[model samples]
Target chain A: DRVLRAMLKAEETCAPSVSYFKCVQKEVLPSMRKIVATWMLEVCEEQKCEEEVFPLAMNYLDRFLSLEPVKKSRLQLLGATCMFVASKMKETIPLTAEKLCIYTDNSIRPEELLQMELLLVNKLKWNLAAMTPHDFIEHFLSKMPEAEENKQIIRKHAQTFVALCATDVKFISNPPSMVAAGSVVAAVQGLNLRSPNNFLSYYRLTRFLSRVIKCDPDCLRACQEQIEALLESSLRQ
Target chain B: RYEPVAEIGVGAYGTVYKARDPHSGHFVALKSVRVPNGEEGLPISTVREVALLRRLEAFEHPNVVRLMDVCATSRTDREIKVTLVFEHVDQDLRTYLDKAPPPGLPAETIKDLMRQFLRGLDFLHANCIVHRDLKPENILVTSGGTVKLADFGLARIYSYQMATLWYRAPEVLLQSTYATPVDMWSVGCIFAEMFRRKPLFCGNSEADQLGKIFDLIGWPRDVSSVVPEMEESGAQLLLEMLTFNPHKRISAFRALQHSYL
Candidate 1:
């Protein structure tokens, strides 16, 4: 419990490297990540990596692309390497060099892939744990009123919402801790697990959870709604 | 608080030079990171991570190298370089081992050195940091024989070939996911190296590395035959760390708490 508090305090310090996109490649607009993210999910899901792998990979991808310029063609290489680093970070058995190369259709060799891995690790300063949102998601769900009964359901669904937020560049500015709480409430609302009139009323919950991570209610409220809409659009696709 | 005094040599990421604090006259290592830039000036992620290490600097860990300061160097052709100031140590354990005047490092000396190394790792692993690569070359020692673990999460720039397999864990060799336990396996390998003045597992390739490791696990007595001088507690500690499964491996904390330590 004391350790969780310590972790919460360090979350902001381990933030994504850059703040926001500062310039442009004609093709390297903010939206480029979507296609890159899509490919990343396909490989991870197909390979059946852990649930945290995709979100973690996107965080690495977001941080790396922010640091240096890469052509749109090299986006896939960056995506592959990010997954490689993420798997190592999160998985008990991480993805391998040959397997990552196979996923890229042999476009990038093991030697080239390792080269990129070194680049990403060096840039991110190998502080890869920069406070992932899933850490916060679990924390928020554990804090639920009927958490014992619904914690698992809330977690799996919040996992979905967190990944959805990960796919969008707009949510990058929000601390992962905030996106984490926002995603949990969005999932709580979606599941109707706790209603408006309930003792741990959704309103009361949001207000309290906001201060847990040192966030404002309006910003948390605004970010939570933003996630649900993304999930809504994500549902259609 | 620091200025570069002399050119040391290039590490994996960039050139590491010797430096000094003018008034205190204490020496430091100036390792620069040349961040390749997108149009956003120096990367915000790079800056934030630099800040993250600076925050970890709050750790007055005796076993881990001190990151005294993280400051940005002037830009070169649009690429920005950042300098990380670390307390200077001239000799690492590998060189220390090479210059051991006698039969080798004393068993008592080895135990003291290993305890300090594990204490450093225990602090890092507790904070959720993995050394990823832990070998004798990366372990520093002072003239007084104090041990320090260097390069835990710093520069990994290329041309230095930080890719070492002799001390790598089986999980990494198998391309499976790994965490702090990887360092445990390396710790075991390093411990054995102290008994013999050479590497315990001298594999030329990844396959060979795993082959040598499993060869020890299969019969187990052969490993005992190889390092016959090891005490019962030290051998037991080594066996616990060199386990096949990462889940079963002894962590740095447990290793430090072991009777051997």
Candidate 2:
């Protein structure tokens, strides 16, 4: 894999995952909640995928786990397969079969994936136009109507968050999504345009996210707070 | 008191020839090479050759070449490459073995050759000059059926860092700091190569090569047990070094003293 994970700010961009990770929500499935937390931890530890590839793997995992409830036994296979696909999609120097074998603990033989390969391809719907954090940063920068001073502040926060993601344990499952969502939160917050207490104060973007995830207002706010805490934690290092 | 009577080989640093001096008028070899770039042009081994000759030249050890004199041509600067000179022998081991009769080196002869090689290595080790690259081509058989170590290009001033890649000790391979004991590992390889008539630790890559070395020596359980821990990448690099950890690699002298080696 190119890199296992890219750094994200806990406060600004990763507010959702972070808040969800730290607090208890009676509404969300305990398994999916654990899956999100565990996926981040495991990804951080396993492959050293860079920002470029970590997000791709993360996006794949988030997309899959969002719909499919997988057994822990199969999680490793899912992790390796997602990484295998992500490595091919996102990085220039792809890991070889032998290297992949070494990375996957040699438990999943190369041939076993040959049969399930197309099934995975079909699941991902052959849509390889996956977005990453870098893309998010650029797009967000283009649309911002802020002054140079404020833009610079946002850029600085985004850069700090990027570095934080790298320092955190292995790449998370859907790093790009985490990075994009988290960075958008962090960048807007960095401009002091909206306070962390007012997650709904930002723009229609966060509101839409809340609607899409279908979580309570408290759940969304908690996720935002925890993410902000993580962002601050990343700055310490 | 053997002497060189004719020129046999010439290279960038020197010329080797067959000769005889009236003092003993005994058949011998001569090596005379030009010193250039203040000794940088010549291989470190050649420098050691001269230094070693200065010290051990008087001895008639069966495993070392006997040195006679240090001679230089007055017009060394005129030549494209200054030439060093040495005693010319009848044949190099490679050439001689190729043209020699069947079963030329018997098992017993191999044993004798190894003993002489070890003796020469032992002397060099004691003197703190290691023959870093020990190969069959560097070995020669005298008329008296004795084998001698030759070629000092790859040899260094007994630094733990001096041995060559293929014949190098594990510590050196992992970029670890090292000393004379590293040479002893090369001697072991040379001994094995002499018997099999092939390289003992032929590796395609760093990992592959270390594996070959460890296949014989066995793997190390502790990574830092050996001297010269390179860095924290030590553990990762060690895992890749496979057959054994580089840090725990056996010492050259110990290998020489090993019953199996």
Candidate 3:
């Protein structure tokens, strides 16, 4: 009871208000995100981290930047520290401060990263238990009432779609559950897995998805469109 | 830095001093934790506590202790001395109970304190957090009659390996996967203490603790002679909470709704 309820409450806490995020986008969020993304992608790719690590790091970066605005020069430092924090939370073997500093070409000292980490943790008030799209993906998928075999395939596709959502800033303001649901809906459509022949029809499946995620179809559909647009844009890039 | 007025408490972790903030004229509790000599870096417990306390502050429940600031007195990693500043309460529940006259607190005050305790626990457990350590010593009560949950040094998002044994749930002692119910178990013991004027189950060791719990509540269906003086509803709620099977134990959320509270 608590887990499901807390997930809903966490969505409100994790995502900045839409107006607040827009103000951030207008003020300091343009080229800074590109640099942070590039650096974090490299870090995750180098470490051979699981697909969830990059976005989780980005989630922290965006949350931190939203709470405390930093200069463009300090963006990478913030990015590195966010990843350092994220890796500590999500990884079995976390990246050390020394190794993360090395990734910065020794531009930022190990001590600087540690100091920024402490500052960020204090600024964010140590609320590191961030709820991400990945947290809700399994919960949404399992409620679909599907066969175990089919569940696995759909889960993989959904995770891939959600990973794509993590890369784009457009999904930042969207709730984690919505992003998860949108990805699952989009993944099912893309994989051609939803069936008229199966016990769960396309409409029924979507209704179930919206209800479990505590969203309506129209909102999920709107999220679905943005996700598709993101996918297309990434493909062209 | 604030001037330390007096040394308030000491433990293996650090010494806590009652200090006054010069800027705001606020009386605060300053806990100066030592940086252990090791290659492992800052203690994970401190990190978790800072994060959890910050979240509690953001959530802003009056029942949870307010963390004022976290400070470091040194620059080098090895020589770091971190101090966590929190809003000081007049006394902890244990101290209050200890200083109270015989026959303990009036039933009404106990109910009010229990309500505040459950409110804090509800807010935390609803957020999927487990206050792994929940005892009289950790629950602070103000002179204004407000009770606040404090000492997140051992708290975590869910389950962990650290806690005082007397308040520890069976699943934690057995080393099985646990969650919010573990906190509810601790709350049960605390609720019992409020009436009985002592720890309900004072187990000398892990094995002894489990034995003591079973002896009172009866192994899986024995509520024969436990806190008989407690009102029937409160006693029933306490027994339901002390269930050996963690799955059967009443949750903090449910416990809050009990007539006892």
Candidate 4:
């Protein structure tokens, strides 16, 4: 949320970026079970296994959720085909219908998965601009070469932000990218780490995420609440 | 305040409905939301919309939709669902214009609409806010000759997806760097459409879509400067926006002030 807020503040006029963050904040988070369950169904519907469908599901979900009217019903077919498409893009493993049905553990039937895959391909109009938290974490981690422990902590924080961002509809768009970038930068700042010190980097990135995400106080509050909750629970321990 | 009578629309993160406040018997729209889980879970974009709207509620402009209140539901499904109550708007500009008291709406009516539209744009632009997805569908109407800017917001509205098929600002359509002017482009398109009672730049595909804009606005000149990474078609739009390079289209506010009005 902080990251997304940062991106919005930095860009000022970039709504496409901010819109993506909003999607992350809105669609991907609260109703995660439905989305996840839908993904399982997508794999099941496609009669594909987790190995084949998980990566595909992420790609399709990221791009699909990016749409203005993000419809959830189409998640399954989209997920399956994304995997079907990704498998084609990534490796030699040919995902046959028979193999997928057997692997999905009865999550879905073979014919259903195949049919849904076709429907999804048509529904999506076959545009694949996939993004991942791993990609984000990679950019973040590359710069942090502190003590090994601190590096791990930064890695954990960066990954957590990405995963947390995915659940929130707010972080999926344009602003969040910079906000995420800025948040990583801030976290590094907190660790007394340094990067290229340009006015554009510090000021713009911070401002961009701040306005768009609109959660600086809430983010701080939420963080405080967690610390309090943990303290209270520890007393019981 | 109007009370919620029944759910009219439901999505992954929220549900919208029709309501009538029993006390006043006044109709309103209540939107119940699934509050995002944040600690272990990431708060979704819907939550972000709810968050922004709550803050934006401070601005009470006629052009902008009124946000009455934001509260949460007790039911827990991974995360609690929050609700947003907004003023009830009767119709959207896109569909309403088609049926708006035929023989064409009065010139004054258009003036009133334009005034309100400008007011809304002024408010957002004044605040350095951008409504990236500006379209007829996103504009709402009331019987009182008023227009309320609707949609949760612009920031998180677009993802990595294509620019909205039409009324998309050239900078955005081309993925060039853009700002609030994008909304201006949309408003310009809306203004033209409302007057003509036709979609300003409707097209068959993305390419054809840009062509339609080209016919009205003329082709751009900037080949590379406007958008460092853009297609030829996008580059054209960028050029027009900037025009020392044709790819550079004019500013939205400038366009809004254009004689097209």
Q: Which tens-of-lDDT digit does each residue in A2-68 have in candidate 1?
A: 4456556555545554443565233466677887787788888898888888877887787776668
lDDT of 4 at B153: 54
For model 2, how does the per-residue alpha-carbon lDDT over B102-179 read when each residue is reduced to its tens digit? Answer: 535554565555556667777666556665556555577767677777755333322222222567767565665455
- Count of steric clashes across candidates, in order: 9, 66, 2, 90
- What are the lDDT figures for the candidates, one per model? 0.72, 0.48, 0.72, 0.49
**lDDT tens digits, residue span A1-237, model 2:** 111121222112221142322343334444553454345435534655554555555555545554455565655566555555656665555444445546556876654443233334335433333555665565555555556666666666765565345323322423443444455565576445555543322465555433433335454444445566767765573
Which residue runs of candidate 4 sit more than 4 Å off their true CA positions?
A1-237, B1-16, B31-36, B40-49, B72-82, B101-105, B152-164, B176-178, B219-261
Off by over 4 Å in 2: A1-237, B1-49, B73-89, B95-106, B152-166, B172-178, B203-261
- What would the per-residue lDDT of candidate 4 be over residues A51-161, giving only the tens digit for each residue? 323433454555545453433444444454445544443334435545554545555565565544434433333222223334444544443344666666655555444
Alpha-carbon shift of residue B9 in model 3 (angstroms): 5.0
**Which whole-number lDDT from 0 to 100 does residue B208 have in model 2?**
74
Where in model 3 is the C-alpha error above 4 Å?
A17-29, A105-108, A193-201, A204-210, A213-217, B1-32, B36-73, B79-91, B94-134, B142-148, B152-261
lDDT of 3 by residue, A130-209 (tens): 77788788787656666776677777877777767765665567878888888887777765544545534244556677
Measured with C-alpha atoms, the lDDT of residue B207 in candidate 3 is: 73
Q: Give the TM-score of chain A, superposed on the true chain A, for all candidates in the order listed.
A: 0.88, 0.53, 0.87, 0.45
Q: What's the true lDDT of residue A155 in model 3?
A: 78
